[PDB]
Design a protein around this ligand. Structure first.
Ligand SMILES: NC(=O)c1ccc[n+]([C@@H]2O[C@H](COP(=O)([O-])OP(=O)(O)OC[C@H]3O[C@@H](n4cnc5c(N)ncnc54)[C@H](O)[C@@H]3O)[C@@H](O)[C@H]2O)c1
Ligand SMILES: NC(=O)c1ccc[n+]([C@@H]2O[C@H](COP(=O)([O-])OP(=O)(O)OC[C@H]3O[C@@H](n4cnc5c(N)ncnc54)[C@H](O)[C@@H]3O)[C@@H](O)[C@H]2O)c1
Ligand SMILES: NC(=O)c1ccc[n+]([C@@H]2O[C@H](COP(=O)([O-])OP(=O)(O)OC[C@H]3O[C@@H](n4cnc5c(N)ncnc54)[C@H](O)[C@@H]3O)[C@@H](O)[C@H]2O)c1
Ligand SMILES: NC(=O)c1ccc[n+]([C@@H]2O[C@H](COP(=O)([O-])OP(=O)(O)OC[C@H]3O[C@@H](n4cnc5c(N)ncnc54)[C@H](O)[C@@H]3O)[C@@H](O)[C@H]2O)c1
Lengths: 213, 213, 212, 212
């Protein structure tokens, strides 16, 4: 029969957008189309507030916006564990945690856009051993993005190439490069972002006065 | 003070998508940003069933899907008058009708994507006199689309150039080229189109068995 | 053995751009990849000056620019026959013309971007009999373009879906949406279009005062 | 009178492509449009071979390809200084080097795509003092790219927003997203990349067996 799969998306979700959500749907249809997997759940894990140089809305709000965005989803939920930790946590550790949570066990795979695959090449960003454990022990489902060539990223990285069977490249013939950075700027200018991010998220942002100049 | 404006979008809406909806929002913010207009309403007018060579879902359903898509909009409504006529009607006639309906009168403008502006150049598609009345007596608000250069379309058409003050070019720094043709194909294959078109529209399509192979 | 193929691209080429050229390369690689064909020649056929409601550069200029653009190509050539006819000609007639020449046998296929497939749906634009002859007698090689879904255009066309064996969809893994309308506007504003169209074409345009 | 400007693009150029070249043309036109500057020179500075976790073609090859790509440019040149250093150098040091040479005065500005602005946010990638020196001592000219919002990157950076007078956002009205990674993969598969990168660069690549 089919191997059960849980998809984990780690990211900022500042705020969660229709594209972040579309990523799950495209990935699920892709895995199902292979004939060997059955996606039983998706998890949105917002990053901790201590992360990066960029100023993010409080994780309390990013978790809230995801929960509200996911109310019309019957298979994707937000998990705040990662954001509730005292500090930022390398992605491989978040995978380990959720794998333990599942502990005939479904395979847990990291879901991301092709741009993340490119960041694996950034000096000192990801430890080689972590890249290895991510693709070998968990798996990667990557959704295409304009200007990125995942196939080449895989061919040019010895670690990815060696475990390419555990990397699933998905993509849809659509162009949807709405950036959350633009969303925040537009919101700051009083412009509409309706139909780019969920109606429920816009309501929360308005009610809590988020992303103001 | 500001000139009141009603935006009319004529099209197939087979089915209405998040991009069709985004078009209204981008256009409204653009007109408001000029400082001289106040958009008070938007109208989605699905095309008649006798139109074109392409097979469209019944207008009864396209009107229903738009109504449901617009339930969370406080300023855009669907108007079935055009689709209820015995036969297809040139766009200038639909504008005339809605102008009469409004009859200190707000300006009624045709809302469309830049690709429509390009179709004005198609032999025998639009009567020169209609193109003229559309831009001169009503107005055009055009939203940018990848691969189209509205500014050049305007410069190269003597009629548009002469009335360019009545043509408003809007666009947002986003890439969103999701085609309804892809939506229908995906739906026909059992794939998800969630987050590309409204949740309410997907529910109607599923409940009424639309767009099946 | 592989089937010999000649690719014919009909269009304005006002002016020819790197995108138009790229279309040939992608189509050829796709056809060779199928293992069933051997593309032996490419033909750029600029449209006549009476065509449409547009002020196009004179046909002899568009032919000359295409020729310059193709100097570094060892398999694509421009053919002025079509532009040199007294009047505009439906595309199927251009295919028939070039088919006859080939006979004086390779298969002749129309080469176009996905957007062209969408124009097949435009009321009164293409005669149904002509769409049928194109995909039934000849063939169609389509290069993808952003915002277009060729697979859906084919499936929804009662004529195209019955001839898929003669339709070849070559996907463009790169994003190359450079509009010739934009090229003309930029040129008219005195802005650079270098690296968007061939250097020799830019020079010709300058020398002859085109698009000013 | 207009302020003399020299544009410096640091990058892999593995290999140089039509997009990299287009970036210079768009930036120059944008700067001239402001009416305040006169771009007098463009400089392509390929990165050293010790840089990053990537198997890059040898620096002398990337320099040679850039030189060939630029033969038809009357204002852009490749400078191998950087690639010829014993080790990789932070970009601000390359700017200082080229600034000194200019002195042996024109303003030297870093030229990059919008994506570079986003990398400024990457933990430990760029020293804050360096980002400050780049936009405060020199200048930054950014060319738009699909999926990136430079205006937001600037507004959200406590360093960039304080130096907007020295940041110039040049918008790319065309869609030109051709990945050098894709170019390399296509080449390795024996597929054409003609019209995506200069002909002379393709020839050099073939002659020297690069990307096989
Ligand atoms: N463990 C490590 O060493 C290490 C190093 C760097 C980053 N990280 C992790 O990586 C994450 C960084 O997330 P982020 O700030 O980029 O998240 P984000 O909110 O910007 O995006 C979330 C996800 O959406 C995808 N996405 C966004 N727009 C898309 C589109 N249009 N199409 C397809 N996919 C799209 C992104 O690729 C990403 O996978 C964090 O969880 C961080 O902890 C880990
Ligand atoms: N009066 C005439 O002579 C004449 C001739 C031809 C067509 N028409 C009219 O034109 C309409 C044709 O509509 P259609 O079939 O193209 O409608 P459609 O459903 O495909 O699209 C509706 C609108 O959405 C815009 N749009 C779609 N995707 C977009 C995106 N990603 N970004 C921005 N805008 C986007 C389109 O430009 C269009 O204005 C009909 O109302 C028809 O009656 C009139
Ligand atoms: N026989 C008929 O009934 C009929 C009806 C309408 C048009 N036509 C013919 O169709 C042609 C119309 O040509 P045009 O004005 O669009 O020519 P054009 O110069 O704009 O483009 C020529 C070709 O390039 C392709 N192309 C352009 N940019 C591209 C990109 N970025 N990526 C991929 N492909 C790209 C186009 O799809 C087209 O196939 C003429 O030859 C005309 O006679 C025939
Ligand atoms: N000093 C530091 O701390 C530091 C840290 C990281 C990187 N760097 C430097 O940054 C550079 C990294 O270069 P790279 O590997 O990205 O080079 P690259 O060859 O990929 O590209 C070079 C330039 O082209 C631009 N570009 C590419 N495709 C484009 C397109 N389609 N449209 C517009 N612009 C486009 C890129 O944005 C970039 O500015 C190196 O010089 C490196 O030393 C410096």
């Amino acid at each position: 029969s089919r191997i059960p799969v849980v998809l984990l998306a780690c990211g900022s979700f500042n705020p969660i957008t229709n594209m972040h959500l579309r990523m799950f749907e495209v990935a699920r249809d892709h895995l199902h189309q292979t004939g060997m997997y059955q996606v039983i759940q998706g998890i949105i894990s917002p990053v901790n507030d201590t992360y990066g140089k960029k100023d993010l809305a409080a994780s309390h709000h990013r978790v809230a916006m995801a929960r509200l965005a996911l109310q019309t989803s019957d298979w994707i939920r937000v998990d705040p564990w990662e954001s509730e930790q005292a500090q930022w946590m390398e992605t491989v550790k978040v995978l380990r945690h959720h794998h333990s949570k599942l502990l005939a066990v479904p395979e847990l795979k990291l879901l991301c856009g092709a741009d993340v695959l490119k960041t694996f090449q950034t000096p000192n960003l990801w430890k080689d051993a972590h890249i290895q454990e991510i693709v070998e022990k968990f798996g990667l489902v990557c959704v295409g993005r304009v200007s990125h060539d995942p196939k080449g990223y895989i061919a040019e990285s010895p670690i990815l190439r060696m475990h390419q069977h555990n990397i699933h490249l998905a993509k849809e013939p659509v162009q949807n490069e709405i950036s959350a950075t633009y969303i925040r700027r537009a919101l700051g200018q009083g412009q509409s972002v309706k139909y780019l991010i969920p109606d429920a998220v816009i309501t929360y942002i308005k009610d809590h006065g988020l992303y103001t100049k």
